[PDB]
Nucleic acid binder design. Structure first.
Ligand SMILES: [Mg+2]
Ligand SMILES: [Mg+2]
Ligand SMILES: [Mg+2]
Ligand SMILES: [Mg+2]
Ligand SMILES: [Mg+2]
Ligand SMILES: [Mg+2]
Ligand SMILES: [Mg+2]
Ligand SMILES: [Mg+2]
Ligand SMILES: [Mg+2]
Ligand SMILES: [Mg+2]
Ligand SMILES: [Mg+2]
Ligand SMILES: [Mg+2]
Ligand SMILES: [Mg+2]
Ligand SMILES: [Mg+2]
Ligand SMILES: [Mg+2]
Ligand SMILES: [Mg+2]
Ligand SMILES: [Zn+2]
Lengths: 130, 66, 141, 37, 185, 174, 139
RNA sequence: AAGUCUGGGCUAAGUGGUAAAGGAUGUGGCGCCGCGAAGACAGCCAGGAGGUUGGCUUAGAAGCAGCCAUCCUUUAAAGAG
């Protein structure tokens, strides 16, 4: 009850290796399209951290229990988390804003963000690279 | 073809159109033209030639011994 | 199929089938077994039918153990004859089998595989059966 | 319809039902339709 | 790995009564004592299906004694495949004769060749102090092809822990393995 | 997991009046009485209607869902209306309105004429679609079905009367 | 005047005859179908064999465009192990062998087709496609 | 002739009031393990992907004739199906 335990920690570890986690709704991209928009933010965002997409449920117990600013942007819906700090991003979210907002009908769409340690915002996070 | 105790050899294109090569026992080619025409809407055709002989099935052979 | 090779006597009295088995009640060799839920004289051809069925399931293959063997000769008079004029002819051989006997065992096979196998084997037998599986209770005996 | 003493699921789309006193197996594939009897 | 079990004393109670009552009539003895016990079936079952005649089971009698026992026999009712009676042996500090599991490590060359590991012993007899009861004994069966066996004579063996059966006692065998191809004949 | 407890939103402005034995549903499109087991309790609330059962005894749970849906269907009946579409298919085949009556022409040696029951209204928009529409759900169903029955889909050809949305599954035939 | 198509084929080396799937789904290009025998067997006339993948596109003035991939895993491994065919039965009879560092170069050939962009990841796919054909990795 | 007698329970077949192998989401009652608000089961919305037609085998068996093996990769996940 369960590997939801080994899964939380692995999200904490990858959060406890940051201060700046963003969050995207990786919805309907195929597989071709997917290993693209992913390998994208691995060649524009260090290590191998594009998204470590996991359960909205466990991704709020983690932000909750590191306290990490209560990431309550919107953990509703499909939710993936573009770990911008286990990388080395900045306006490298532009690497997101350019792939999604052209190669789809709403490609890698964004939801929440917490730069430095401070809550980023809605379109004010989604323009945080324009 | 298989259902007629045949054994198929291969498939190539022609007048496009296609061709299918097979060894079937002659005992199973009687009045073929008509099933062929049924199975192909009266649009296919065939040629057929003796190639060789071989051991009829142990379950055919011993019916024949009458 | 099964039958003694030689016998001290050729025909035997019919006897009676009261009782739980005498023994044979615990799994002895395999992992899975099939126990008689009711009395019966089981026939050589019935055993054989079941055995065969089992091998056919495994294809190749596991291990079948057969724990009953028919040493009772079964007698029958010729069709259409009257009573009298001596005991009937041996026409086959049977195994007396009382409830709780483990009749067949299997091994070297998956759970799914031994279950099914014993199911089919059951269907060739003229009694109720249950499938069982080795236990501490078996080993303890 | 098949009518038998033994009625049973034949494929995974087979479904065992009880109408009006009788056990039927209904299925997408009409060959599996059974009614016990 | 050392299991426990409430166990109670009994005198004149008809076994039928007890059995009806969910309980399992039994007996405890060694050479110093012999007492009539009963244990709740379902509690007994849960333990013995792991303990068996292999591990110690500690009987917690009402007088607050806690005796260490091995199960020595279990009488099954033949018709209904169930326990009617148990014999708990009260272990003392002497060496004891008992049964030690065999763990068959390895995949036989015989298996993996179509064939089957007839495991003729799933445990083995052993003289031994209760104080070093080996919960295991491994046997490598890797060098076995269809045709081979292994006797007690092999068998590594801890300390100590001697045998308690002839060494010439065959313990495992690899045998050929049912074949539809045979059938027809 | 449950139909009966699922509350029923009632639209502004249809009205639901409970009696013992029945509930009545009125709206823009007619009115309907829905028979209800006297063992269930129908409950009225603001812009909602609920159904409550007196225990978890099998008959009650079975009555429970059935009753909720029965009322739900009436609510929807008088407010949105019900309707089903039949597609006609096959070369000679067509339909046309004749009064309120549907004349079906489908390859028998004669047309087939279907009088709509009361509460049911037929629409032949093109000449190969028929529309059965009405306030009563099951009745709509029954008539759609009756019609379709005049000549079911063939096993061998995309031919016959079809529920729109009903798949054409064929089998080869020579 | 047929539509803008995104065709995917798999034709081997040599047989460049405009017959299916070089016929039905390749009419829609008005394709110089026999321009392939020459624009393919010029990158594969030094090699000889190897199935070399392809995607064949058409636009609005009826012309075709094609680009290819790299020869199968199963292929490359065969001619570094002294083999024509595989091993019939995978497991009990290896009919070839490759060092840890020869799979790596085979890997290296396939680096621009796969999923990973590694070597230590890449090489085990290779080594894993060596069990699939029963040839043991010299290690 | 004498209780439409009293308390508990089951049955819906007129079973009761004619039978077996066997078959079944009939109905009730036990028990054992399992998943579950770190969100299960059901519906429904995505994805379900590479190395790769896996090797062999027919003429073709490209996840799904059939013999083997059943690895590796990106992965939230995705079987050599
Ligand atoms: Mg007698
Ligand atoms: Mg008999
Ligand atoms: Mg006689
Ligand atoms: Mg039977
Ligand atoms: Mg004995
Ligand atoms: Mg049957
Ligand atoms: Mg169905
Ligand atoms: Mg049991
Ligand atoms: Mg028990
Ligand atoms: Mg209605
Ligand atoms: Mg009708
Ligand atoms: Mg009364
Ligand atoms: Mg009846
Ligand atoms: Mg009656
Ligand atoms: Mg009756
Ligand atoms: Mg029951
Ligand atoms: Zn079915």
């Amino acid at each position: 009850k369960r590997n939801v335990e080994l899964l939380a920690t692995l999200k904490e570890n990858l959060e406890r290796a940051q201060g700046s986690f963003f969050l995207v709704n990786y919805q309907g991209l195929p597989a071709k399209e997917t290993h693209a928009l992913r390998q994208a933010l691995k060649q524009n965002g260090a290590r191998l951290f594009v998204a470590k997409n996991t359960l909205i449920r466990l991704a709020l117990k983690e932000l909750g229990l590191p306290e990490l600013d209560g990431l309550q942007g919107p953990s509703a819906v499909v939710f993936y988390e573009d770990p911008v700090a286990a990388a080395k991003t900045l306006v490298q979210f532009a690497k997101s804003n350019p792939k999604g907002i052209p190669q789809v009908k709403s490609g890698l769409l964004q939801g929440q963000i917490l730069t430095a340690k401070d809550v980023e915002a809605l379109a004010e996070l989604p323009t945080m690279d324009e | 073809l298989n259902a007629r105790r045949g054994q198929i050899l291969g498939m190539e294109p022609r007048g496009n159109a296609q061709v299918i090569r097979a060894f079937v026992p002659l005992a199973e080619m009687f009045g073929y033209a008509t099933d062929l025409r049924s199975k192909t809407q009266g649009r296919g055709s065939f040629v057929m030639f003796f190639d060789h002989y071989q051991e009829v099935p142990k379950q055919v052979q011993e019916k024949l011994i009458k | 199929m099964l039958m003694p090779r030689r016998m001290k006597y050729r025909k035997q009295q019919r006897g009676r089938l009261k009782g739980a088995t005498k023994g044979g009640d615990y799994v002895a060799f395999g992992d899975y077994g099939l126990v008689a839920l009711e009395p019966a004289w089981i026939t050589a051809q019935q055993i054989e039918a079941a055995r065969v069925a089992m091998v056919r399931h495994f294809r190749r293959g596991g291990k079948i153990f057969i724990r009953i063997f028919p040493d009772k000769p079964y007698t029958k008079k010729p069709l259409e004859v009257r009573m009298g004029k001596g005991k009937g002819n041996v026409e086959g051989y049977v195994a007396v089998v009382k409830p709780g006997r483990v009749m067949f065992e299997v091994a070297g096979v998956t759970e799914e595989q031994a279950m099914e196998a014993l199911r089919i084997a059951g269907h060739k037998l003229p009694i109720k059966t249950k499938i069982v599986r080795r236990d501490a209770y078996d080993e303890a005996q | 319809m098949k009518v038998r003493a033994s009625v049973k699921r034949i494929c995974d789309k087979c479904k065992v039902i009880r109408r009006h006193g009788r056990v039927y197996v209904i299925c997408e594939n009409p060959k599996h339709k059974q009614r016990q009897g | 790995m050392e299991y426990r079990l409430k166990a109670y004393y009994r005198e004149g109670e008809k076994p039928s009564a007890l059995r009806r009552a969910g309980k399992l009539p039994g007996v405890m003895y060694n050479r110093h004592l012999n007492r009539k016990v009963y244990v709740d079936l379902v509690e007994f079952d849960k333990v013995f299906r792991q303990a068996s005649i292999h591990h110690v089971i500690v009987l917690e009698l009402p007088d607050g004694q806690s005796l260490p026992t091995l199960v020595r026999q279990v009488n099954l009712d033949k018709r209904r495949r169930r326990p009617e009676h148990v014999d708990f042996f009260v272990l003392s500090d002497e060496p004891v004769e008992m049964y030690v599991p065999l763990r068959f490590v390895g995949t036989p060359a015989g298996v993996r060749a179509g064939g089957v590991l007839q495991e003729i012993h799933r445990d083995i007899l052993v003289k031994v102090s209760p104080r070093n009861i080996p919960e295991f004994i491994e046997v490598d069966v890797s060098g076995l092809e269809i045709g081979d066996s292994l006797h007690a004579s092999d068998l590594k063996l801890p300390p100590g822990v001697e045998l308690a059966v002839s060494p010439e006692e065959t313990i495992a065998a690899v045998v050929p393995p049912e074949d539809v191809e045979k059938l027809a004949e | 997991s449950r139909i009966g407890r699922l509350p029923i939103p009632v639209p502004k402005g249809v009205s639901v009046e409970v009696a013992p034995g029945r509930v009545k549903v009125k709206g823009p499109k007619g009115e309907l009485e829905v028979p209800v087991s006297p063992e269930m309790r129908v409950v009225v609330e603001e812009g909602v209607v609920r159904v409550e059962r007196p225990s978890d005894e099998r008959r009650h749970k079975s009555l429970h869902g059935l009753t909720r849906t029965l009322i739900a269907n009436a609510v929807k009946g008088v407010s949105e209306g019900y309707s089903k579409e039949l597609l006609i298919k096959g070369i000679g085949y067509r339909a046309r309105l004749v009064g309120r009556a549907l004349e079906l022409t489908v390859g028998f040696s004669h047309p087939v004429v279907v009088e709509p029951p009361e509460g049911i209204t037929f629409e032949v928009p093109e000449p190969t679609r028929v529309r059965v529409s009405g306030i009563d759900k099951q009745k709509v169903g029954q008539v759609a079905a009756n019609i379709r029955a005049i000549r079911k889909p063939s096993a061998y050809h995309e031919k016959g009367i079809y529920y729109a949305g009903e798949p054409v599954r064929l089998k080869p035939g020579k | 005047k047929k539509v803008v198509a995104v065709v995917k084929l798999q034709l081997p080396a040599g047989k460049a005859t405009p017959a299916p799937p070089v016929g039905p789904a390749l009419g829609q290009h008005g394709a110089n179908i026999m321009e392939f025998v020459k624009a393919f067997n010029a990158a594969t006339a030094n090699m000889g064999d190897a199935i070399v993948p392809v995607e064949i596109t058409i636009y609005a003035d009826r012309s075709f465009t094609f680009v290819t991939k790299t020869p199968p895993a199963s292929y490359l491994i065969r001619k570094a192990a002294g083999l024509e065919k595989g091993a019939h039965k995978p497991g009990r009879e290896k009919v070839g062998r490759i060092t840890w560092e020869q799979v790596l170069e085979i890997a290296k050939q396939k680096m621009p087709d796969l999923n990973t962009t590694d070597l230590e990841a890449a090489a085990r796919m290779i080594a894993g496609s060596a069990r699939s054909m029963g040839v043991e990795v010299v290690g």
